[PDB]
């Protein structure tokens, strides 16, 4: 009867409920609402989370990036490498800067930056790698910081969707990284509204996010530096505060999902599924299949009253907001196979089994009609 | 005993407590956090409030500013004329853009463009005028359009302290206004975070904006054009749909405050009170006094049991952030006087009267010290 839902946020508020409403009626009840103890503690909290020493929150994702470039002196005239597959606001936040965005095609196995392509790509102008753990999975980063330490780059990481991941047991924002996150209410850690954060080991580069993210000053009214506006909610940071408490949990029931989905799913002939790259801990943002006939394996799928969706539609190169500066269409290849071919099957940590293995039976049906 | 308060901004919740928690509740159980019907509806209520035909709900006053400026195609060579005296953000949208702010002077006595000056620093690369409706007081806008009109600029105000005010007995925002606000907190409209509005009544400019603040987007993943993130939540839009049915409501108190400090200050030996122009109806976002020796002022008032503030001790042309590209310090008398001489009295909706007349007899004691 009832649609299996691509993603069911009150689900999220339902599981917490009581502690949320709690989270809530404390902020609206402390009379500080900006850069306060909330912010302060979920910072802390997720800098730790994160195994590095320091965090600063932000209004989205895409602001994370942006202020994390800008605070590595980014600008007009760099060059960033950017992933050819990704969602837009990883080229934007670098065009934000007046930096130049730099599109690298994805592994041949993997939706992330391939390595040799990286190298290939570097010129005199690159200042810095923007690699995307794409959909939960992580980048080769020993291969980028080897790229990056030889070539003298700065490495933002697009961490968006990978929030608790491992990249060779480390999580993804540890030690020395750099990494900026999106607490986008669909993210694997939401909240109620726009948010988002910089990790990173340096102290320096945290302060000056500090001041960017805040009018440019630390003391009121003492505009040091030009900056901008771009907080993370006292109300936001007190949900985020609960929310980050059940993240393993949570990302443990998705990589349970995918398990069920990829064995359910093995062998389908023209159905390709993603191979998780060795030594790493994916946290499963979304689960993507590959086909020709994606467009009617969807209709199949809502036909038989399954929610999907598409990461994404159009190869960011060929967006209407890029194509007069991007790569011609043909040149980026991988991006727009992918563009072509995928779908993302519903997942999350509210997810029931039946629910999946619904999914699934209308896949293999699909496939094995066609 | 205890102090007299700046703004509280917990009384703002406490007065209205039952029907905020049942706001934010509801937003809570809707499984709906961005890009809703309460932004839905706070934008319809919000841009009626203003007698205009649109309201975009964004991030923040800053944003509006932005992406106001970027949607009416301002850029990279053009030049916005600038109020020397105003908040840094007025400026820093501007150079957002990439464009050049370009700093002109208030009246002597009006925290406003000064009509007269505008129209000297008026180049080729000129595009916009950004006047400041500051303190809650609006900016002379007949003068300013005609400037503009002539000039062919376009006019993007900064109505972010000016919420509801009205020049010539229409609302800041009204008509074929391009105005930002911002729902900062503390601002007159306040919500519970960050976040701010651009209201015209242009269906263009209107469409333009919706797809700059959610990264260039009418639909989901078609990139028209670059964009950004820069929205309102559902979950503040949900308070703001109150916090506006007593916008004018608390406004009046402020008025009431004002009328107060202006009979019981007056013909005070060196204090300057806020004059309100002709024409227009203020909203008193603050109230603001100038003295020669404001930080003894200051000193006393704190001692008096008094919170007050400045706005602003330091003239954005010198500020280190723009301090390189300014003007040099002298060259801005205006805008250098009022912050060296300007201190922000308690007022706001939530003020008793007892407190302000407080603030009154430490004024008026000061005032009156033998000299
Ligand atoms: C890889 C990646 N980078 C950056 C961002 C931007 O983060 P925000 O905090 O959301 O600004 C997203 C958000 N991806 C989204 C959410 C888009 C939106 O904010 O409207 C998505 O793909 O649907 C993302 O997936
Ligand atoms: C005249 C004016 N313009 C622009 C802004 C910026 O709007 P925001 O939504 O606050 O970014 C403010 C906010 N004035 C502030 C609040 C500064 C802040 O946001 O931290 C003030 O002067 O304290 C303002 O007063
Ligand atoms: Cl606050
Ligand atoms: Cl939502
Ligand atoms: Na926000």
């Known amino acids: 009867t009832p649609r299996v839902p691509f993603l069911d946020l009150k689900a999220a508020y339902e599981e917490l409920r009581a502690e949320t409403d709690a989270a809530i009626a404390r902020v609206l009840d402390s009379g500080r609402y900006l850069l306060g103890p909330e912010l302060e503690g979920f910072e802390a909290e997720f800098a730790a989370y994160c195994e590095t020493d320091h965090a600063v929150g932000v209004n989205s994702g895409m602001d994370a990036l942006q202020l994390a470039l800008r605070g590595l002196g980014i600008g007009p005239g760099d060059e960033v490498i950017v992933p050819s597959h990704t969602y837009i606001a990883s080229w934007l936040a670098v065009s934000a800067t007046g930096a130049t965005p730099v599109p690298v095609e994805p592994h041949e196995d993997h939706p992330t930056l391939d390595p040799l392509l990286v190298e290939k790509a570097i010129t005199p102008r690159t200042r810095a790698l923007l690699p995307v753990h794409l959909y939960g999975h992580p980048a080769d980063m020993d291969a980028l910081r080897e790229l990056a330490d030889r070539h003298g780059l700065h490495i933002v990481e697009d961490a968006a969707q990978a929030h608790g991941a491992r990249y060779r047991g480390r999580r993804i924002g540890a030690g020395s990284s750099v990494a900026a996150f999106s607490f986008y209410p669909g993210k694997n850690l939401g909240c109620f509204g726009d948010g988002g ?150 997942i999350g940590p509210h997810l029931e089994r039946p629910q999946a293995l619904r999914v699934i039976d209308a896949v293999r049906e699909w496939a094995e009609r066609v």
């Open 197 to 346: 954060a910089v990790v990173t080991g340096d102290p320096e580069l945290a302060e000056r996010l500090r001041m960017l993210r805040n009018y440019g000053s630390r003391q009121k009214y003492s505009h040091e530096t030009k900056g901008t506006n771009s907080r993370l909610d006292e109300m936001q940071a007190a949900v985020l505060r609960i929310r980050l408490a059940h993240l393993d949990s949570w990302n443990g029931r998705r990589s349970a999902l995918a398990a069920e989905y990829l064995s359910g799913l093995a062998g389908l002939p023209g159905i390709g599924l993603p191979v998780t790259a060795p030594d790493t801990d994916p946290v499963w943002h979304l689960f993507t299949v590959r086909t020709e006939r994606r467009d009617e394996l969807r209709s199949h799928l809502d036909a038989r009253g399954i929610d999907t969706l598409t990461h994404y539609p159009v190869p960011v190169h060929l967006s209407p907001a890029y194509a007069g500066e991007a790569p011609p269409e043909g040149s980026l290849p991988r991006a727009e196979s992918f563009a072509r071919q995928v779908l993302s099957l519903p």
